[PDB]
Design a protein around this ligand. Structure first.
Ligand SMILES: Nc1ncnc2c1ncn2[C@@H]1O[C@H](COP(=O)(O)OP(=O)(O)OP(=O)(O)O)[C@@H](O)[C@H]1O
Ligand SMILES: Nc1ncnc2c1ncn2[C@@H]1O[C@H](COP(=O)(O)OP(=O)(O)OP(=O)(O)O)[C@@H](O)[C@H]1O
Ligand SMILES: [Mg+2]
Ligand SMILES: [Mg+2]
Lengths: 388, 388
């Protein structure tokens, strides 16, 4: 066991790569308090990679952190957890937990995985490893802290994170930490649909999506969240839907790394697409009615029972509804309303759906619609007229 | 002589084709006042075309009008000139004029042209013509009301309007009303650049642009407004900049007849492009700077001067500058920095300008950055990945 690591044996974790939350600790260290830098970035820093967050912890009570910062711009409460604002840098200052407020060692144990529970002191350039941490981090092991069996039951979402980190970094899950998941997965439905929604995005809409999907399928974690989707999987391995999902992911992923923004209302409208389509079939031949009105029903239901697991905000769903709406409208080769359409705020997305539907189905008559809209949108108004 | 023309013999401008701003005349009529429809609409109505606006006039004091609508959603200010709201519909309710105000006849006179001073009462289905009005409308004639000479001097913009209706509707300008213009044209430099901007857009940005520039040039009214451009015309008639101003207008026009949002900041960057391309090259040699630094000065220069004539909003100038800047970046066959660009809020307009530049210069070098950016902008991140 090795509880304190020195700056000379610890990957340099050079004081200078820490931005200036250093101003936030220095203030504490000066006041007779303790300043530690915990979790995310402190992991990354040891890895060599650039921190995305910088969060800190202290033996200073929350009302004590209030006085020592009353002059600062402290953004919004929470319990414990204080929020300092620079601007485009916000720094989280949280008090150690234990009866309620305790020691550094105490705080370490209530944290989830090993590597995400390493601590840095600007004051002594030492990192504290009350857990496997350092080794896990070297060996590339996502390990949980207490008794997996119990933790996952206390907070089931702890399971989701295990995969998420597993995918993000090149790491594998500890056996003990992995055993329980497939069995305990179902536990996710005792989770408020909203919290889920957050984590669904943390997983896919985070630029790892594809590797995190493989991992969510290999642990039966995908099913609880997207019932409406698992059901249309096939033995064969790659149905139109089973490809599209891999693609919209792989791509949303490329986007996020070339730093482009991304539409979640898209991501979803893509996956559920085929399911919607399938419900259009049954809705039509059965309960025989028009294919427009039929489609429109499939929407409400598919979105209903999907919104039954993930809590999608009314905002998103409504763009989604539009992305699908456009799929029918575009299909009907026609004239003057193409300006009306080209203008639509969700066209860009809607074109990128048609993009995929044509790539996956390899339906040459679709890609055909894809070249046309392709040119009719980069073309200039004299040509755009002639195209009709 | 023939001052009152009845529902049957007058193009039946039919009570049915008046938006329910009838409900506002009705209150007026019921209340002992009379209330008439004027100009904009009544003109189009007699021409058959759908009005774009309905403005009522009454012999009620602006005071009497204020009171008889208290219950209503009446939007504020403006001597005389009262305003009432519904939905997307606003109804303009101004009082006659003539100490200050008076007879329906006394009002017919302070109005700029003969057509735009026809009057309609729903209460008797007659239209009152106290000017050439009816005949002129039949004939296709824009004819200022009193003495052109004096009036233009009273309000020089009356000249611009005159030329605008001339191109919008399909009709010719009255001899008596055309003579004074080429002479008196300069008078516009006395007018606050504010009004000129306003009216500059009613001329080119209402989708009559091309025809309204065939006139603005053929009556030397163009010059007072756009000094910076006038200067660069070539007797040839076929310079790149001259072709560009044609096309951009022809196109802005198309955009408007197909209900597509149009951008003002684009319009301008398009015209002044070549005057900007010129002032840059002259700043390049005359003073041995780098081109990138040279260009940027030229931007300031062209703007200040145009700003000297048209009060162009600090808003639109920013966008413009950017649309231009983008033209430097889209030039370099850029690497992974292109994702950032694709994202720019203006990229569509910057593209649309590379579009024209390539078409008018009839340059193949440019015509390639067009074909390229056309694909790189509709492709998928897989494909797009590769292109780079
Ligand atoms: N419900 C919970 N139970 C126990 N510990 C928790 C819980 N929620 C958060 N934590 C702790 O918070 C820390 C994670 O912080 P945060 O949520 O900002 O993500 P992170 O570790 O920075 O993730 P990333 O590696 O993606 O940056 C972990 O060390 C974890 O132990
Ligand atoms: N400064 C002015 N001097 C004299 N008359 C004016 C003045 N400003 C406006 N008018 C009168 O207002 C009427 C025009 O109304 P408005 O400004 O709504 O345009 P419009 O005639 O409806 O144009 P359009 O044909 O484009 O619809 C004209 O009949 C004109 O005589
Ligand atoms: Mg946290
Ligand atoms: Mg008006």
């Amino acid at each position: 066991q090795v509880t304190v690591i020195p700056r000379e044996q610890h990957a340099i974790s050079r004081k200078d790569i820490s931005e200036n939350a250093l101003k936030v600790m220095y203030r504490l260290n000066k006041a007779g308090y303790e300043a530690w830098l915990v979790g995310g970035g402190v992991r990354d820093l040891l890895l060599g990679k650039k921190p995305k967050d910088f969060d800190v912890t202290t033996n200073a009570t929350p009302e004590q952190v209030r006085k020592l910062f009353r002059n600062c711009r402290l953004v919004g409460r929470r319990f414990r957890l204080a929020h300092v604002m620079f601007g485009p840098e916000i720094i989280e200052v949280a008090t150690f937990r234990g009866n309620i407020f305790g020691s550094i060692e105490e705080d370490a144990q209530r944290r989830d995985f090993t590597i995400n529970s390493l601590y840095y002191s600007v004051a002594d350039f030492t990192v504290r490893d009350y857990v496997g941490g350092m080794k896990d981090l070297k060996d590339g092991v996502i390990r949980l802290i207490g008794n997996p069996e119990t933790r996952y039951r206390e907070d089931p979402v702890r399971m989701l994170r295990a995969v998420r980190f597993a995918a993000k970094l090149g790491m594998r899950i500890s056996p003990e930490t992995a055993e329980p998941i497939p069995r305990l997965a179902t536990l996710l439905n005792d989770i408020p649909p909203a919290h889920l929604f957050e984590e669904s995005l943390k997983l896919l809409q985070a630029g790892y999506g594809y590797e995190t999907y493989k991992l969510l399928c290999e642990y039966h974690l995908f099913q609880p969240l997207f019932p409406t989707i698992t059901r249309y999987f096939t033995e064969n391995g790659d149905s139109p839907m089973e490809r599209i999902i891999e693609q919209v992911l792989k791509n949303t992923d490329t986007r996020i790394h070339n730093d482009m923004r991304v539409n979640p209302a898209f991501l979803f409208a893509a996956m559920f697409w085929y399911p919607l389509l399938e419900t259009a079939q049954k809705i039509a031949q059965e309960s025989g009615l028009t294919y427009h009105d039929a489609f429109a029903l499939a929407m409400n239901d598919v979105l209903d029972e999907a919104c039954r697991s993930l809590a999608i905000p009314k905002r998103l769903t409504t763009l989604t509804r539009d992305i699908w709406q456009l799929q029918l409208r575009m299909s009907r080769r026609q004239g003057k309303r193409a300006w009306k359409l080209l203008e639509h705020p969700k066209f860009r997305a809607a074109y990128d759906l048609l993009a995929l539907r044509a790539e996956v189905e390899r339906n040459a008559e679709l890609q055909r619609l894809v070249k046309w809209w392709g040119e009719f949108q980069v073309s200039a108004p004299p040509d755009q007229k002639g195209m009709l």
